[PDB]
Every structure is written in structure tokens, then in C-alpha cells.
Design a protein around this nucleic acid. Sequence first.
DNA 1: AGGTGAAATGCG
DNA 2: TCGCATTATCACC
Length: 202
Amino acid sequence: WRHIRAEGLDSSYTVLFGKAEADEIFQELEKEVEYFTGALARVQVFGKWHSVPRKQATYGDAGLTYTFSGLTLSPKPWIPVLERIRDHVSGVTGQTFNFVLINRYKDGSDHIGEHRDDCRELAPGSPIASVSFGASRDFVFRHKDSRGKSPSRRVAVVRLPLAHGSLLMMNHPTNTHWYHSLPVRKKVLAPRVNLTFRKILL
DNA sequence: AGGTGAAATGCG
DNA sequence: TCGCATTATCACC
């Protein structure tokens, strides 16, 4: 495993699946995952509504829901594909998950803006499992006190590419202290599907 | 209450 | 292209 470590950043990266396998899995994912459309894909930020620059889906146990930027998504019942991955992931990390956010970026122009994972529904201390398939993309971590016109402290930005069939483990207190994003990457033409598995509450 | 801080856009 | 700081409104803490 590759241990990524800065001030308040505890996370780890490894490649879980071969190319052949990851290729197979990526194919099933594409075949099976039903993405949200219309109303279920428009967040609100600074009081302005927008369709997300990508496609989303939530799969998970009954009852749970996932809310961000003015949008609430109740999860779809598990499917054999995802159920197989979470079990594999659960097995390797030790940790357990009852939910998964799926973002698919069709090309390097689809992206996600900066934020942390810090919602009431999120289990305090629980790690998050980012499992990527398809195109490599750069995943960027910036520190809480480092953003803005003139920051509190200036710390090295942490950049890294998330390869095909790879795991990124976001342990605690990572998501307390560090913002993350997937910036635009014009030179990318292929799609990427990312699975963030997490533990949700109530 | 009373405080904070968050998708596209427009720089360098 | 890319990084990233702005946005001047409003849900959430």
C-alpha cells in the first residue's frame, strides 16, 4: 500500500483488481448502474441551481438517505455487482459499509468542485472507500486552513492519480481537515466510474 | 439567535 | 489549460 500522509491526512492507495478483471467489472458497472436524471441531479449552491457536471447514483440499505448541496437522494436496492465489491472491500479493510455514492465522469470535462464529506448522516470516524474504474483522473486534496485570499497556514497541496481498478481509503481525521476535488482534465477523452462506499446513520 | 461558508464563472 | 479565488445567496451549525 502507498501511505499518503500530511498534517491531518490519513489515507492509503492500492490497486485491487488486475486489468482484465477491472476491465470486466467496468463493463458490468456500465451495463448495470442506473444513474439519477432530471430533478435528482440538480444541486443548489450560492442560491443557484445546476445540473451536476457528471452522473450520480446512490445504492444502499433501505431507509438511509444522502443529502448535499440542497439535494436529498434515497438509495436504490443493492445489485449483485456492487454487493460483490463492497464485500471484497469490507473484507480487505476490515471496515463495513451500507452505502455507496457513484459518480461517473464521461470525459475529463465532467468534474466535481471542492468540498469535504461532513454530513450528520456520516458515521463519526468511519473511513471512506474510493474505488475507481476506467480512466485515470487526478484527485486533489487541499487543507482546511490553506484555502482563501490569505490563508491561516500554507501547506503543500496533495495531488494523486486514481488508476483503473484502484482503492483509495480515506481514514479519519482526513475528511475533517482536508477538502477534495476532481478537477477538469481536458486531455481526457475516456469515461471514469468512481465508487465511494461509506457508513450512514439512521 | 448569530455565525459560517458553499455550482459556475472570470482572472493570472 | 489549469489552478484557484470569487460569488453577495441561503441552508446548516
